[PDB]
Amino acid sequence: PLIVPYNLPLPGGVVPRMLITILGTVKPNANRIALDFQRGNDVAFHFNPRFNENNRRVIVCNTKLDNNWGREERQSVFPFESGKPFKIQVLVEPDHFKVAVNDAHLLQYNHRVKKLNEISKLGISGDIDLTSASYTMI
Ligand SMILES: Cc1ccc(S[C@@H]2O[C@H](CO)[C@H](O)[C@H](n3cc(-c4ccc(F)cc4)nn3)[C@H]2O)cc1
Numbered sequence: 522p523l524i525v526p527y528n529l530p531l532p533g534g535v536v537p538r539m540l541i542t543i544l545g546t547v548k549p550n551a552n553r554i555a556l557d558f559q560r561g562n563d564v565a566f567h568f569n570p571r572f573n574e575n576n577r578r579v580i581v582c583n584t585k586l587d588n589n590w591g592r593e594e595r596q597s598v599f600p601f602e603s604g605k606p607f608k609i610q611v612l613v614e615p616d617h618f619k620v621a622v623n624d625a626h627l628l629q630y631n632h633r634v635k636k637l638n639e640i641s642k643l644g645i646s647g648d649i650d651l652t653s654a655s656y657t658m659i
């Protein structure tokens with residue numbers, strides 16, 4: 522397994538048609554996972570499954586600019602399960618990140634950070650065993 526937290530460089534940032542694939546297994550009794558697509562210190566797209574927020578499971582997405590989190594976008598469809606293998610696919614489209622989990626569409630997140638070629642890191646964190654993290658063009 523890869524070390525977590527994991528830093529995947531995205532050379533020259535992201536671009537529409539770029540597909541990022543994360544494979545891993547959720548730990549037993551997991552509490553949280555995060556993907557952080559970063560522009561320097563800013564977080565263009567934070568994708569954060571929370572397994573126990575007031576005894577509910579929710580995915581929280583947001584952007585961090587100059588160290589400040591913005592308006593959250595929340596999704597109660599929650600495709601992860603403790604102890605189970607998953608695939609997250611993040612497809613960069615012209616106007617949003619499109620996320621599918623286990624080949625099922627989950628959510629879109631409109632681009633708030635607009636210099637896509639400066640979003641040149643993906644951080645992967647939390648309660649997973651990380652099998653692989655990679656990108657390809659479709
Ligand atoms: C004014 C105010 C007060 C509190 C908060 S809470 C905040 O909410 C954000 C989304 O809006 C992010 O989720 C953020 N966060 C989570 C993680 C994380 C790191 C490793 C990991 F495995 C899972 C998750 N890193 N940063 C969380 O601290 C927000 C605003």
Ligand SMILES: [Cl-]
Pocket residue numbers: 553569570571
């Ligand atoms: Cl969290």
